[PDB]
């Protein structure tokens, strides 16, 4: 299973003219490109090592796609402004994301595409990829404009043929990395809270992909975690980190196990401290 997703963001700026436009591309949990109409070089540019051996032909085209999207989105922000009867003074956000996913066979499993205005679902592309559906009541005129114009087809073509095709080329270019599973380095830390209790915190460091799951269990096992769990976070070197903590009665530490589940480990590791 692999995916190729892009995230597009356009933010209006009443004062400073043209709204900011940003695009980032990912292959699974690895960002490989980006575009920013506000940086030194508007260009789609490389953001992963395995993308520095590409020619002008590639960068010019993607740059063209990013720039065209930006211009349309400029127009769309004025349009969306008219729909919510919002004044020209405030700043607003138009978001667009699209992606294709492969199944194990390595072939097209599914595709997706949706727009959002000011952080809310606006227009979504149907599961079969053959028509649109307004998710926000205010997006209904866009749904018809779009279905009548038959715009889903060009998106479906892209999601099934182009996206998938390139997802394959990308995995091949960055195989050394992209296909390698990096399991987590693990351990449980002990942090006394008082003379009665103490927090048991299980660590998972430097793993990839991001998906992982840590589960505390002690043991007359009614339920039951009540665990403090932080959002899986990026180490900054391409890998991820996470931990799950609980409060144990002092002396009762050892009755606790932390189960670590991830793709890169031949099977789940169990931690006790």
């Amino acid at each position: 299973s692999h995916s190729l997703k892009y995230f597009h963001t356009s933010v209006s700026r009443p004062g400073r003219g043209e709204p900011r436009f940003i695009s980032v591309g990912y292959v699974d949990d690895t960002q490989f490109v980006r575009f920013d109409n506000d940086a030194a070089s508007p260009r789609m540019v490389p953001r992963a090592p395995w993308m520095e051996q590409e020619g002008s032909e590639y960068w010019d085209r993607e740059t063209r796609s990013a720039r065209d999207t930006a211009q349309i989105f400029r127009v769309n922000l004025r349009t969306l402004r008219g729909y919510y009867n919002q004044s020209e003074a405030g700043s607003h956000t138009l978001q667009w994301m699209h992606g294709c996913e492969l199944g194990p066979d390595r072939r097209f499993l599914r595709g997706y595409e949706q727009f959002a205005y000011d952080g809310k679902d606006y227009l979504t592309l149907n599961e079969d990829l053959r028509s649109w559906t307004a998710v926000d009541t205010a997006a209904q005129i866009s749904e018809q404009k779009s279905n009548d114009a038959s715009e889903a087809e060009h998106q479906r073509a892209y999601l099934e043929d182009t996206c998938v095709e390139w997802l394959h080329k990308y995995l091949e270019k960055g195989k050394e990395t992209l296909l390698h599973l990096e399991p987590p380095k693990t351990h449980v830390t002990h942090h006394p809270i008082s003379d009665h209790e103490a927090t048991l915190r299980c660590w998972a460091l430097g793993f990839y992909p991001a998906e992982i799951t840590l589960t505390w269990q002690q043991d007359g096992e009614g339920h039951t975690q009540d665990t403090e769990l932080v959002e899986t976070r990026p180490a900054g070197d391409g890998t991820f980190q996470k931990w799950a903590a609980v409060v144990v009665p002092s002396g009762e530490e050892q009755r606790y196990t932390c189960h670590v589940q991830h793709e890169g480990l031949p099977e789940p590791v169990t931690l006790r401290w």
């Binding site: 940003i22 700043s91 956000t93 952080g119 915190r201 990026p234 180490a235």
Partner: protein, 100 residues
């Protein structure tokens, strides 16, 4: 209009070891709009030349960014992240705890 407050996590790239070079990270996520200011501090001092990742967002549309800078943890020095966002009545400061 929808607005979400940023969740914040301050931490080091690799396990903290006094004297050993490392990276101080501040990951902000789950927020909306994307306008946001993030400072990494040293003894309240505003560290300069801090870099950040490219603005992206997740399925729920909320943005996320990783801010960072090279640093050398000591036993005496204190580090923190200062975040300002339209949803915060006042700048929020969360201090680095090598145990989290």
């Amino acid at each position: 209009m929808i607005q979400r407050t940023p969740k914040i996590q301050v931490y080091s790239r690799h396990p903290a070891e006094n004297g050993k070079s490392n990276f101080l990270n501040c990951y902000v996520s789950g927020f909306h709009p994307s306008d946001i200011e993030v400072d990494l501090l040293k003894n309240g001092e505003r560290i300069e030349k801090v870099e950040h990742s490219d603005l992206s967002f997740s399925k729920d549309w909320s943005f996320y960014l990783l801010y960072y800078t090279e640093f050398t943890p000591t036993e005496k020095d204190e580090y923190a992240c200062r975040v300002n966002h339209v949803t915060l009545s006042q700048p929020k400061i969360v201090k680095w705890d090598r145990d989290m």
